[model samples]
Target chain A: MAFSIPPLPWGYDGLAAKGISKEQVTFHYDKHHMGYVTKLNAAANSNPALAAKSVEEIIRTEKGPIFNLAAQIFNHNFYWESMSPNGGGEPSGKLAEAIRASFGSFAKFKEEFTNAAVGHFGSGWAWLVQDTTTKKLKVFQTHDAGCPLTEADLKPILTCDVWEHAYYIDYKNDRPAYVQTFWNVVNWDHAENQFTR
Target chain B: MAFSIPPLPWGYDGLAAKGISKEQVTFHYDKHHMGYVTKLNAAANSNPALAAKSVEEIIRTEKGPIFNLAAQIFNHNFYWESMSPNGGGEPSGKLAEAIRASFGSFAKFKEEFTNAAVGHFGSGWAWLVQDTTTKKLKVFQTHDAGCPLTEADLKPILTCDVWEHAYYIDYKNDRPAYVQTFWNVVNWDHAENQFTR
Candidate 1:
C-alpha cells in the first residue's frame, strides 16, 4: 500500500489563532508529519512485507525500524485529529460521560492528562484510550514510536505529542506551558468522533 | 545526598557564540539539566536508600526510576565536561591513536560517532566510550535515561547528547546539523583525559 499524508483537517493557519502558532503548525504539519509519510514510502522499497501491508496492518504486526516509522506515521495523523481550531471547552455526549465514569470528573481527567503530557521523561506521547476489556477510558504514556494499536484491547481516543519538535517553536522547553494551551485548542469534536465510532 | 546542578564550564552565552545559542544553553542547563537534579532530590525522600549512596554507587546498584534520575545526573555532568571553549576539531596523542586503532582512522571514528549522534531514534545520547575489558573505543546509543555506566565494564569517555532538549532551540529537529556544529565545538581534551586513564 502507498501510504500518504493526510491534509490537516483544517487550514494550515487554523491552529494559529488558537495557542498553537502559524510557525508551529506549519512546520509540524508540513515538515515533521509529512516527512514521516515520505520516509515510510521510501522504506517500503527495502522491506517487501512492509510494502505488502496497509498502514493499520503494519502497525499491528511490524517491529524494529519499519514499525518505528509506520507507527509514527499513524501516531502523527491521530495527533493532528486530536486538536481543533475551535476546539476545547469540554467534550460532550458519550465522550464526556466516559470521562466522568473513568476519571471522576473532567477536571480530574485534564489534570491527569496534563501531568502525563508534561512529565513524560523523553520524546513520547500522552494518550487517552479505551481499555476495551473494561470499556473505560484511561490515560496512557508511550515512549518514542509507541502506539495504542499494538495492544489488542486499547482504542486510542485522543493524543498529545510530547516530542520536542511538537512545540519547540512556540514553547521552547516550556512543555508544561504548551500542554496548558492544549486545553484551549483541543478538538473535542474530533476526539468525540473517535469515541462514538 | 543532595545532587546539585553543576556550573556550566563556560558561560551561558559561551556555546552560543560557537553555534549553540545563549538561549539554547541557558534553557538546557537551567531547566532540563537542573530539573533532573530537583526531581532526583525529591525522589530520594521516598527511596531512603538513595540518600546514602554516591552517584556512581547509585548508578551501579539502583534500578527503575531511581536509577534513571541518578544516571541522568551523571550523564549531564559528563555531557557538560564533554565540551569546552577549546573543545572540538580533533584529538591528538593516545586518544587520536585509539580512534585510529579501533575504528580504522580518525575520519572513520568521526563518521561513526557523528552518525550515532544524529541517527539515534529518540530522546537519548550518543557516546564515545572505551570498553574496559577490551580497551577499545566505540560509538554507542542509549535511549531515554540510558547511561552506559549501568553495564559492568563500559566506561563512557565522552557523549554527544541527541536529546531534543539538548538542541531543539538551536537546531530544532535538524539534529544532523546540530551534530555537525558539535565537531567544531567539541571538548576533545576532556575526552583525552578519559582515554589516558
Candidate 2:
C-alpha cells in the first residue's frame, strides 16, 4: 500500500483574508505537509507493517522516524481542518458549556489556549483535548511531531499548529500576531464535533 | 548582568548572494536570535543567580526554559560564525588532515554532515564536532535549543541550523537546497579554530 496527502479541504487562497496567505498555504500544504506523505511511503518500503496500519494506528503504536513521519501527516491534516475562511468567534452548545465549566469562561479558555500556542518552545501544536478519564476539557501541548491521538485518554478537539512554517511566510517572527489571527479563522464546528464525538 | 545579543559578525546581506537572504538574516538575527536574549533576560528576573552566571554556565548547569533560552543564544551565535561570504572550498593544513583521518575524505565528511542537516526532524542543528574522548571529528545533531557545549567531550566545530526559520524565508520547505547552499559559505577558518583550540 502507498500513502498520499488528500486534497486540501480548501483552495490555497481560502484563508487569505483570515490571516494565512495563498503563498503560505501553498508552501505549507504542497511542500511541508506532502513531504511527510512522501517520506512515509519510503519508510513503508522496508516495513510493510507500516503500510497495513492506519495513520492513527501507527501514530499510537510506533516511535522513531516512522512515527515522526506518520504523526506529522496526522498533525498537518488536522491542522488544515482546524481553520476555516468563515470561522472565528466563540463556540456554542455542549463544547461551550464544557469550556466554561473547565476554564471558567470562554475568555479564560481563549487566554489559556493562546498562552499554550504562543509560549510553546519549538515546533509543535497547541490543542484543546477532552480527557477521557476526567471527562474534562483542557489545553495541551505536543512537541515535534507529537499527536494527541497517541495518548489513550485525550481526544483532540481542536489544534493550532505553532510550527514556524505555519505562519513564517505571513508573519515572519511575529508569532504572536499570527496566533492572534488564528482566532479569526478557528473552525469552531470542528472542535464541537470532536468534543461531542 | 542582563543577557543581550552581540553584533552579527557580518552584515545582514553578507550571506544573501550565497543563498540566505537579507530578510532571512534580519528576522533570524534581529528577531529570533534577539528574542532569545530578551526572553533569557526575563527569565533571569525571578532567578537572580541566573544573572550572576555566564550564558555558558547557565547552559551547563541549568535545565528547562532557562537552558533552552541560553543554549539557543549560544547556538545562533555559533551558526553565524560558521559561515562567511569568503568561505567555501575545503579546509587545509591540520584541519584538512583531521577531516581526512576522521571521515575518510572531505567529500565523505561533507556527505555525512549534509545528511545530518537535511535529515534532522523539526527545530535543531547538525554539527561537525570533535569528540574530546576519542579526539575524532564527527557529525552530530541536537534537537531544539540543544548545544554541543552542553557536553563536556563534544567540541562543536561547525553547525547548520535546521530549524525551519533558518531557511524558510529563502528556501521555503526545501531544506536540502538550503543545506547544499550552506557549503558555498562554510567558514573553514572557523572550523579550524574550533578544531585546533
Candidate 3:
C-alpha cells in the first residue's frame, strides 16, 4: 500500500493559540514527520519480507534498521492529533472521574502529567493510559518513540511529545510553561474517545 | 562494592557563573544522578550475573536495563567536569584548529552546537566530539542518558546536559538562552585533554 501524509485536523492557524506557529508546524509535520513516513515506506519496500506486514505489525516486530523510522511515523501521527487549537481544559465524565480516582484530583493529575513530560529525559512522549489488567489510569514516559500501543493492553488516552521540536520555538527553555499551556489546549473530547476505546 | 555519591568538583558558589545554581547542581548530583548509581547497584546486586561486571562493561554490554544506568553515571560525571565557574572563551591549539577545520569557524561551531543542544528532544546531552575515524569534529545529541562513547569511536571534548533539571529553574524552557550561557562556562582546557586522550 502507498503511504500518504495524513492531514492535520487543524491547520497552522488553528494551533496558533497553543503557541505553535504555521512555519514551525509546517516544518515539523511536512519536513520531519512526513519524511519519516516516506523513508519508512521506502525501507519496507526494499525488503520483501517487511513489505507484506502492516505498519503497526512491522513496528511491533522489527528490532533494528527500520524500527526507528517506523516508530517515528507512528509517534508523529499520534503527536499531531494529541494537540488542538481549542484544546486544554479538564477532562469530564468517566475520564475525569478516573483521573480523580487514580491521581487524587484533576489538579494532582495535571501535576503528575506535567512532571512526567518535564522529567522525561530526552526525545520521548509522556502518556496518560488505561492499564487493561487493572483498568486503572496511569501516567508514563516512553523514551525515543516508544509506545504502550505496541504492548496490546495499555490504552493511551492522552500524550504530550516532549521532544524539543514540540515547543522550542515558542517556549524556548521553559518547558514548564509550555507544559502548563499544553493543559489549556488538550482535546478532552479526543482524550475521552481514547479512554472509551 | 558500595556505590556512593561522588563529591562535586566545585560548590554551588563556584558553579554560579556556569548558570547552574547550587540547588540545581546539588539536586542533579545528589538526587538524580545518585539515584541512577544507587538503582544500578541495586539491580546488579539482585542479579549476581551482572554484579561481576565493571560499570563500563555493564554499560557496553547491556542495552535494555543496566547500560542506561551506567551510561547516565559516566555521562553525568563527565558533564560535571566539562564546565567550570571560570570556563568559556576560545579554545587554544589543536582542539581550536580542529573546530575551525571541521565546522568552518568557532562561531559556526557554537551555532551548530547550540542548535543541537536546544533542538534535542527530552532529557539528553549535546556533545562536541572528535570523530576518531575521520579525525574531525562533530556535534551530536544523545537521548535519555545515552552517550556516543560506546556506539561510535567519537571522543567527547565538551558537552552540555539538556535535561530539564539542568536548566528548568534558571532558564525555564528557553533552551537557546541556556545554551548560549553554556558557551560562557565551557572548560576548553578540559576539552583539549579529552581530545588528546
lDDT of each: 0.87, 0.91, 0.78
Best by lDDT: 2
- Candidate 1 DockQ score? 0.71
Binned by DockQ into CAPRI classes (incorrect, acceptable, medium, high), candidate 3 is incorrect
The lDDT ranking, best first, is: 2, 1, 3
Q: Encode model 3's per-residue lDDT on B1-197: one tens digit a residue.
A: 54544577777567775677776676667766887888888887778877777667766778865688888888888887888887889998988898899999999998899889977655789998888998988998887768777866888888899876677556655678888888888988789899888
- C-alpha lDDT of residue A138 in model 1: 93
DockQ of each: 0.71, 0.84, 0.16
Who wins the TM-score comparison? 2
Query: What is the interface root-mean-square deviation of candidate 2?
Result: 0.6
- Of candidate 3 chain B, the 10-residue stretch with the lowest lDDT total is B1-10
Model 2: CA > 4 A from native: A45-48, B45-47
> What lDDT tens digits, residue by residue, belong to model 3 across residues A59-112?
788876577667777777777778888787777899899898898999888888
Ranking of models by TM-score: 2, 1, 3
lDDT of 1 by residue, B1-197 (tens): 56776699988888776788889888888888887788888987677767667888988887887788888888888988888767778888989988899999989998998888878998899999999999999899999889988888899889988888898788766888999888878898899888788
- Cα RMSDs of all predictions? 1.8, 1.4, 9.1
Candidate 3 lDDT for residue B125? 93
Please report the candidate that would top DockQ against the real structure. 2
